[PDB]
Amino acid sequence: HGLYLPTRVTAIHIDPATHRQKLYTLQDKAQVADVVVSRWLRVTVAGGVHISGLHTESAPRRQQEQQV
Amino acid sequence: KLSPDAIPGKWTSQDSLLGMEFSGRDASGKRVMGLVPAKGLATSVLLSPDFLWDVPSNWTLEEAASVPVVYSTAYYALVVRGRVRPGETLLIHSGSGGVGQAAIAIALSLGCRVFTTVGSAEKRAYLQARFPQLDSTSFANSRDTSFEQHVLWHTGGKGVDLVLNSLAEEKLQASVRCLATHGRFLEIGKFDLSQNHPLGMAIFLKNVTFHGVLLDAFFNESSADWREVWALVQAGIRDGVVRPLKCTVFHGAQVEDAFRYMAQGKHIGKVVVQVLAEEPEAVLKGAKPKLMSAISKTFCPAHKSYIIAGGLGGFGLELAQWLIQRGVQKLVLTSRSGIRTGYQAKQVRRWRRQGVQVQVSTSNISSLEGARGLIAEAAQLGPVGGVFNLAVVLRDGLLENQTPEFFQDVCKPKYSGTLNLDRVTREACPELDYFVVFSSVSCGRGNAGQSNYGFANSAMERICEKRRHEGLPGLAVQWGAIGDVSGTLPQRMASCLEVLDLFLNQPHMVLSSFVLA
Amino acid sequence: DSTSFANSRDTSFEQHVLWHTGGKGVDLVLNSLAEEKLQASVRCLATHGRFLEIGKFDLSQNHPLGMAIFLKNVTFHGVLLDAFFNESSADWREVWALVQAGIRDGVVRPLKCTVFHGAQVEDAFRYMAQGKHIG
Ligand SMILES: NC(=O)C1=CN([C@@H]2O[C@H](COP(=O)(O)OP(=O)(O)OC[C@H]3O[C@@H](n4cnc5c(N)ncnc54)[C@H](OP(=O)(O)O)[C@@H]3O)[C@@H](O)[C@H]2O)C=CC1
Ligand SMILES: NC(=O)C1=CN([C@@H]2O[C@H](COP(=O)(O)OP(=O)(O)OC[C@H]3O[C@@H](n4cnc5c(N)ncnc54)[C@H](OP(=O)(O)O)[C@@H]3O)[C@@H](O)[C@H]2O)C=CC1
Numbered sequence: 001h002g003l004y005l006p007t008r009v010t011a012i013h014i015d016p017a018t019h020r021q022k023l024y025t026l027q028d029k030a031q032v033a034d035v036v037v038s039r040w041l042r043v044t045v046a047g048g049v050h051i052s053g054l055h056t057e058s059a060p061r062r063q064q065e066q067q068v
Numbered sequence: 069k070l071s072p073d074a075i076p077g078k079w080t081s082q083d084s085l086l087g088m089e090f091s092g093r094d095a096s097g098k099r100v101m102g103l104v105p106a107k108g109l110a111t112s113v114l115l116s117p118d119f120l121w122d123v124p125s126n127w128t129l130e131e132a133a134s135v136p137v138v139y140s141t142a143y144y145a146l147v148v149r150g151r152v153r154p155g156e157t158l159l160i161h162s163g164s165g166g167v168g169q170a171a172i173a174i175a176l177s178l179g180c181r182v183f184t185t186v187g188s189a190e191k192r193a194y195l196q197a198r199f200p201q202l203d204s205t206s207f208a209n210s211r212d213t214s215f216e217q218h219v220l221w222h223t224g225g226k227g228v229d230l231v232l233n234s235l236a237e238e239k240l241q242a243s244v245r246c247l248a249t250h251g252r253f254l255e256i257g258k259f260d261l262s263q264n265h266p267l268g269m270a271i272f273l274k275n276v277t278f279h280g281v282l283l284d285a286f287f288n289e290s291s292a293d294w295r296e297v298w299a300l301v302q303a304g305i306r307d308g309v310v311r312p313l314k315c316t317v318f319h320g321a322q323v324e325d326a327f328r329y330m331a332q333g334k335h336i337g338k339v340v341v342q343v344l345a346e347e348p349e350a351v352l353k354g355a356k357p358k359l360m361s362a363i364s365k366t367f368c369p370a371h372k373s374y375i376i377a378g379g380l381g382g383f384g385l386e387l388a389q390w391l392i393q394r395g396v397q398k399l400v401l402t403s404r405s406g407i408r409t410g411y412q413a414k415q416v417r418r419w420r421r422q423g424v425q426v427q428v429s430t431s432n433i434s435s436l437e438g439a440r441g442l443i444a445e446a447a448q449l450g451p452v453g454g455v456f457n458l459a460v461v462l463r464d465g466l467l468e469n470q471t472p473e474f475f476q477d478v479c480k481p482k483y484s485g486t487l488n489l490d491r492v493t494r495e496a497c498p499e500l501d502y503f504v505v506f507s508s509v510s511c512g513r514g515n516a517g518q519s520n521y522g523f524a525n526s527a528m529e530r531i532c533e534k535r536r537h538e539g540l541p542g543l544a545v546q547w548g549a550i551g552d553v554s555g556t557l558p559q560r561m562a563s564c565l566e567v568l569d570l571f572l573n574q575p576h577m578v579l580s581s582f583v584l585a
Numbered sequence: 586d587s588t589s590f591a592n593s594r595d596t597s598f599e600q601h602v603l604w605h606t607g608g609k610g611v612d613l614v615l616n617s618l619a620e621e622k623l624q625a626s627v628r629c630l631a632t633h634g635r636f637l638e639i640g641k642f643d644l645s646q647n648h649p650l651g652m653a654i655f656l657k658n659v660t661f662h663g664v665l666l667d668a669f670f671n672e673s674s675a676d677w678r679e680v681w682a683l684v685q686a687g688i689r690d691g692v693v694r695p696l697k698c699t700v701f702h703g704a705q706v707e708d709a710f711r712y713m714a715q716g717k718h719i720g
Contacts, residue, residue, distance in 0.1 A: 001081050002073055008264060008653075040608030041600050053628070058071040067563055067583050149660075249668070261656045266649030272663030273644050280655030285632065 003061035010053025019048025076284045077105055080393050084109075091123065091133040092344070093355035099123040101132040103140060105287035109323075111343055111357040118291060121302060129346045131312035134166065134338035136301075137283075139310050142170035143300045145254045145281045150230050154179040159219055159228040159246055161235050162210055164191035166313055166338050167256065169198075171232050176201050177309040183219050183228060185210035194336055210235065213242040220246065227251060237265050250275040313337040320344070320360070364573040366394055372453030372499065373398040373446045377433050377485060380405075380412050382553035383506070383564075384458045389415065390565045392424055398449040402429040402442055402459070425449050433459060434480045439488035443496065454502025455489050457482065457528070464517050478520035483527040490531055494540065502572070505532050507546045509582050515554050529578050536577045545571055548582020556582040593618065596625040603629065610634060619643050633658045641665075696720040 023031050033047030044051040075085050087109025091101040100120045104113055123132045146152045152175065160171045163184030175182050176199060185208045186192045192207050205222055208215035219228055227248030233240055234257040244267075247253060253276065255261065261280065272278075286294040304310040314337030318326035323341055330339045344357055368374065368391065379388050379401030388399055399419070406428060407413050419426045429445060432438035446452050459481040463474040486505055493500050510518045511525030528544060535542030545568065551558025559567075559582065571579045588605050591598035602611060610631035616623060619642040627650075630636060636659065638644065644663065655661075669677040687693035697720030701709035712718060 002071075041603050043600075058073045060071070067557070067560060250673070255652075255655060258656070261652050264651045264653035267652045268647045269638075269644050269650050270647035272638060272661070273641070273665070274663065275665055275668055276663050278655070278661040280657065280659050282656070282658055285658050290633065 003059045004056035005059050006054060007057040008053070008055040009051060010055075012052075013050040015048045017048070022047045075106060076282075076288055079106070082393060083107070089133065089136040091129045093352055094120070095355065097349075097352040097355050099129060099132075099350070101136050103136040105284065109341065111360055118295065118298065119287075121298075121305065124305060125350070127312060130315055130317060130340065130342070133340045134313045134315055135305070135310060138166035138170040138313065138338070139174075139304065140297055140301050141167055141256065141281075141283050142174050143304065144283060144297050145232055145256060145279075146171060146174055146230070147300055148297060149279050149281055150232075150252045150254050152178060152180065152230055156180045156229045157183070157223060157226075157248075159183045159185075159215075159231045159233075159243065161185050161233055161239075161243070162187075163195050163207075164336050165234075167232075167234065169195075169313055169337070172199060172202070173309060173311055174304070177307075180230075182206050183208060183215070183222070185215050187211050191336060210239070213239055216242045216246055223248070230254065233257065236260070237263070240265075244271055247271065247274070247276050250277075252277045252279065254279045254281055256281050315340045317342045366569050366572050368394050368396045368453060370395060370397040371450045372396075373400065373450040374453045374502075375400045375402070375442060375446045375455045377402045377442075377455070377457045377489070378459030378481070379403065379456070380407065380428075381458060381460075383550055385412065385415050386553055386561050386565070387456060387458065387568075388426075389419075390568075392419060392422070396424065396453075398425045398446075400427045400429055400442070400446040400449070402431060402433060404430060404432065406430055433457070433485035433488055436488050436491065439485070439492045440496075443489075443492045447496075451499040452493070452497045454500060454504070455493060455497075456502070457486055457489060457505045459485055462518070462521055466517055467519060470520060475520045475523065479524045479527065482524040486528045486531050490535060501541055503532070503535060503540070503542045504572070505529075505542075505544050507544045507578070507580075509546050509548045509554060509556065509580065512546065512580070513554060533577045542577065543571065544578045546578070546580035546582075548580075555585050557585055559583050593622075596621060599625040599628055606631075613637060616640060620648075627654055630654065630657070630659055635660045635662065637662045637664050639664045 019033075023033055025031055035044070035046035037044050042053050044054065072079065072083075072085050079085060085106035087107065088105070089101070089103050090108045090113055091099070094100045099122070101123055102108070102113065102115050102121075103119045104115055107113060121132075121136065123129065152158070156178075158171075158175050158180050160168050160175070160182060161184075162168045163172055163186050168184060172182055172184060172195075182202060183206055184195065184202070186195060187210050195207070196202060196204070208218045227246050229248055229250065230252050231243055231247060232254045233243045234255075235243065236257075237260045240255070240257070240260050244253060251274065255278070267278070286297070301310065316326075316329070316335065316337070316339050318329070318339065318341050320341060320343045326339055326341055329335065374391060374396050376384055376388055376399070378384050379399075380403040384401065384403075388401065391399065407416060416426055416428075427445070427449065429442050431442040431445070433442060443452060443455075461477055461481055463470070463478050465474070482505075490503075493503065505528045507525040507529050508521065509515075511522040511529070515522065525546070529546075532542040532544040547559065547564065548554070548556035549558040550561065550564055552561035552564075564581070567581045571581075591601040610629045612631060612634050614626050614630060614634065615637045616626045617640045618626065619640050623638075623640070623643050627636060634657070638661070650661070666680075669680060684693065699709075699712070699718055699720065701712070
């Protein structure tokens with residue numbers, strides 16, 4: 001639980017060509033990309049983007065002037 | 069500065085992780101000193117026997133409160149990891165602190181030479197007085213990086229075989245250069261490690277060994293390994309190596325003063341909080357803590373069973389999770405449709421993974437047979453602890469638009485359901501202690517197009533008021549609006565649950581909450 | 586088994602080890618590779634793991650090593666058997682003893698030998714340089 005934000009990313013690979021190739025259209029004209037997250041291998045693959053070793057560090061999650 | 073999530077282990081969202089060690093009488097009265105992952109700063113701690121030591125007869129419960137953590141970590145760092153041998157050379161940063169004193173006491177017993185860094189002159193004098201074997205050439209300065217020249221000079225350019233480091237990034241880099249061939253670097257600090265500051269690997273051209281020493285791992289796993297450190301500390305206690313550090317006592321009521329004094333940074337030894345005064349007797353038959361006055365909080369027994377009506381709704385799931393964080397372990401959620409949404413299934417599976425005995429009833433509360441069945445099936449898991457009525461069906465419209473059937477439909481779950489729950493609970497729920505009914509601001513304050521809703525909520529409030537007069541439990545809460553899941557802004561769920569806890573603790577029959585525009 | 590071999594010419598072994606270990610990683614990593622292949626080896630370590638570095642390239646170059654891997658209990662070792670031959674004679678006996686025990690107990694088995702005659706020593710050097718030898 002809490003508000004975790006990125007602090008370090010070991011490596012990110014971006015390839016627009018395979019991104020254009022991976023995209024597919026739904027019944028609507030909107031365009032989507034299938035994403036897969038593997039917590040064992042610490043890799044997030046979606047379309048033509050590949051993020052590995054993402055590290056998220058707990059933020060304070062403290063906001064001022066909270067509702068009274 | 070340190071986030072609670074940074075503490076390894078599974079921890080509830082609402083809890084305190086202050087205090088790692090303590091000393092006090094066991095359930096049988098035997099004096100014992102313990103080491104706990106957290107929650108050790110309290111009038112009572114639930115601990116495993118493998119983390120307890122028997123206090124020597126000549127020690128005091130005040131003195132034993134400081135031995136466990138510092139000496140356990142010193143032994144783990146040196147003997148288990150660094151494998152210190154007699155006659156070696158060490159560099160122990162921040163000698164004055166507890167870990168430094170423990171490491172020096174361990175090292176001098178073996179027979180090594182020790183270099184220690186102390187911030188000020190008073191700490192230097194104190195260390196010189198406490199450890200006579202230690203020499204004026206064993207001291208240096210910790211706040212400045214001038215100890216590198218001192219250690220290198222006095223060691224003749226060889227360096228120190230074993231380093232126990234707890235300093236910052238630049239001091240850490242300075243310390244690494246002090247290592248000799250076959251050196252061993254014991255790192256107990258966190259700042260450099262957490263920040264992932266780079267470490268040049270050329271130091272490993274020698275046979276240097278770099279150790280990452282965290283003691284929190286033993287509380288989480290590797291107990292078979294922990295017993296080694298336990299035996300080491302017990303042997304140190306009985307042999308005479310282990311000595312209790314200097315202690316400054318702050319009474320229980322002055323805990324904030326203790327925190328402030330430690331924060332100032334002028335302390336030497338350990339700071340302790342005298343929660344309760346030691347009795348003269350060595351072994352006391354009844355070691356119950358004295359009654360203390362503390363802010364009230366809500367927790368639930370595990371053996372009891374808790375029922376929520378319409379618990380699969382937007383507020384129902386959040387209330388159920390809030391309850392589980394209080395340790396319910398047996399939950400019944402009522403809903404006519406059943407699990408039809410992905411979020412509901414996700415939450416239910418998450419809860420069942422933790423071991424909670426979540427249950428889906430699909431048994432109406434409006435029908436007396438339905439209320440009896442719901443209460444019975446919750447009794448099978450365990451004695452009924454509380455019933456929450458969060459079931460709503462709303463039919464909006466001006467009076468001319470409303471018809472009797474709409475009023476009946478709206479009042480059936482909240483009005484009739486509350487009556488049936490009350491009847492069944494008074495008949496066959498002697499152990500029940502919570503009876504909460506979630507009313508709404510529209511009732512009482514007033515709103516347009518919700519006459520039936522106001523009628524139902526007012527009827528629930530009347531029932532809850534009647535129950536309390538008889539001495540039975542009953543609470544009615546009125547919410548302006550819920551945002552996360554009449555001129556009032558929606559209320560965030562965290563504030564909603566905090567307010568719900570506060571209301572549960574208070575004696576008033578009917579309470580309300582909302583946020584003014 | 587078929588699940589114990591990986592590819593040493595790229596960093597693919599990282600995913601192989603992470604998957605077949607269930608994401609926990611390994612305990613000991615006897616690393617001889619260098620540059621990025623060394624960094625991948627570090628990521629395979631599990632809590633209380635031990636990294637044994639016998640390759641002297643990244644050590645000689647003084648390439649940075651992020652210390653965040655030490656939050657997990659990890660011991661990064663620097664192994665150089667050279668010290669024992671000209672130094673650390675007392676420690677040599679401990680290593681020498683385990684070698685004698687291994688020899689007598691059958692654990693130590695000789696490797697395959699590709700023999701070259703003395704007059705053809707330079708041919709042996711070239712054959713080693715090509716790197717095709719096994720053993
Ligand atoms: N495995 C683990 O994760 C564990 C880690 N530790 C670590 O051990 C380290 C040492 O703890 P310990 O020696 O008992 O701490 P103490 O507070 O008892 O002593 C602190 C020492 O370091 C200096 N110091 C530390 N913090 C401050 C501060 N905020 N302001 C001023 N001076 C400060 C003091 O002055 P000076 O040095 O200038 O004389 C003193 O010598 C800590 O960083 C702690 O996190 C401890 C046990 C378990
Ligand atoms: N903004 C808000 O929602 C506000 C909340 N409240 C109060 O909060 C409570 C809960 O609100 P909320 O959960 O958001 O609203 P919902 O509309 O989600 O409440 C209805 C829920 O109860 C179930 N339900 C309906 N009839 C029965 C029945 N006879 N027995 C058991 N379950 C039944 C419904 O499932 P199904 O239809 O399948 O039976 C549905 O899950 C209500 O009592 C309401 O007065 C009041 C003011 C503001």
